[PDB]
C-alpha cells in the first residue's frame, strides 16, 4: 500500500529528524509516489483528509482567484498573489483580490494544457509558482513551488516539488490536491491519469503532533478511495469544473 | 555504493522505459541522493565525467556570465539568459552576452547565501532558473529548473529538480555540478557539506547510447573521489572561486 510511503516518512522524521525552531522534527529530501490508475485517488486513510477543501481550493486556484471570501461561502477556511495568481498570471503586478487580471501575466495552466494536446511528449510542461521579484509573495511564499506534467502511453502524470511540508495536515492535503489536478487535467485532455510524484525539500513534523502521529502510524492503511470525473455539463477549460463533477467512492479513513 | 542508484535508474529506463520521439527510452519521476560527507564528491566512476567542464561551467554560471567564449578559452565547450543570468539577475531584460546587468534583476544566489548565514533553518532558501515571461529562455529552457539549500546540524544540503535529463552525459555532469555548488557554498559559509538530492521529471536514455549504457552498467562502481576546497587566496563571494581552489583526490573512473 502506497500510504506506507507516507507513514514510513513520518516514522523516519520521528526517529531521525533534526530539531530546528514552534519547534519541529525534520528531514530534507523525500519522495512519495501514488498511482492514479483504475480511478485510484490517494486520499489518506490513516486520518480523514478534508476532501471538500481539497476540491474547492483547487477549483478556486484554477479560476485564478485570490479572495478567501469565495472559499468561506463554500464551507472552507485578500490572500495576495498565492497559487492561482502565479499559475494563471505569472509576472503581473498584483493589486487586490477584487481586481481583474485577464490578459495580464503568463497563463501557465492554459499553456500546459495546450502543450499536453499539441506535444504530449514534451519535457517542458512545467508550471512554476515561484517568482522572486514578487516581494509580497516572497514574504510568505508558496510551499508547492513547481510542478511538471508528463504524458506517456496515454497517461497524464504530475510531479510537484514542495519546498516545505508539514506531514500532519499539509502534506496529505497536497497529495490529494495535485492528484486531483492530474485527474482533472487528464479528463479535460482525453487522457487517463498515470501517477502523482511528490518531491519534498523540508519535511517536518510539529512537536505538538508527535503523539497523534505515532498513534496514526500503527494503523494499517485501508485501500484508497476511487474518484470518478462525471461532469454535470460540458467542460472545455479547467476553471469550468465544479465540486459536483467529482464522485468520491469508497473513502473510509480511520 | 550510491552510484548504484544511477545504474539502477539506467537499467530501469532500459528495461521499462517508454518509447517517445531522435528517439529515447524514458521514465518519469526519479530520485538519487549522494552524501557529500568526508569530502565525498559524486563524480561517476563507471564512465569518466568531464571534471574540468563541471568546475569551469559552475564558476562561469556563478559569475552570471552568458558568453561561451569565456569557456572556450578555458578548454571547455552568446548563449542567452541561461542559468547564471537567471540565478543572479532573475527578471532583468536580457540584451547581449557582452552587456552589464549589475543591479538588474534578483540576485537569488546572494540572497541564498545571506539566508544561509542569518537564518540557516530557513525553509525558503530556493533558487529558480524558470521564468515563463522570458520567451527567449522559454524557447530553450533550463533542464535544471530549481534548487533548495538546507542547513541541518551544521551541514549544507541541496536538492535540485531537473525537468529532463539524459542519463548518458547530462545527468552525471549535473550530479557533479550541484554537488560542487553545495561544497563551494558550504565552504564559503563555514558549514560542512551534507547531501545532494537529485529529483528528476523526465529521465531519458538516447537510443544511440543504449549499447554503451548496458556495458557501463555491468561495471562495479569504484569508491567516489574526494574533493577538497583549498583556496589559493581569500574567497568572500562565490564568483571569486577559481578552478585551482579545488583538489580532486582518488578519481579513478573505468
Ligand atoms: Cl505535523
Ligand atoms: Cl543517454
Swiss-Prot record, chains A, B:
Gene3D superfamilies the UniProt entry points to: Thymidylate synthase/dCMP hydroxymethylase domain
Positions annotated to bind dUMP: 123-124, 163-166, 174, 204-206
Active site: 143
EC code: 2.1.1.45
PROSITE patterns to which the protein is assigned, alphabetical: THYMIDYLATE_SYNTHASE
The protein's annotated pathway: Pyrimidine metabolism; dTTP biosynthesis
Entry's transmembrane regions: none
Keywords tagged on the record: Methyltransferase, Nucleotide biosynthesis, Transferase
GO cellular component, one term: cytosol
Catalytic activity, reaction form: dUMP + (6R)-5,10-methylene-5,6,7,8-tetrahydrofolate = 7,8-dihydrofolate + dTMP
Entries under HAMAP family matching the protein: Thymidy_synth_bact (MF_00008)
UniProt similarity note: Belongs to the thymidylate synthase family.
UniProt protein name: Thymidylate synthase 1/2
Organism of provenance: Encephalitozoon cuniculi (strain GB-M1) (Microsporidian parasite)
Gene this protein is translated from: TS-1
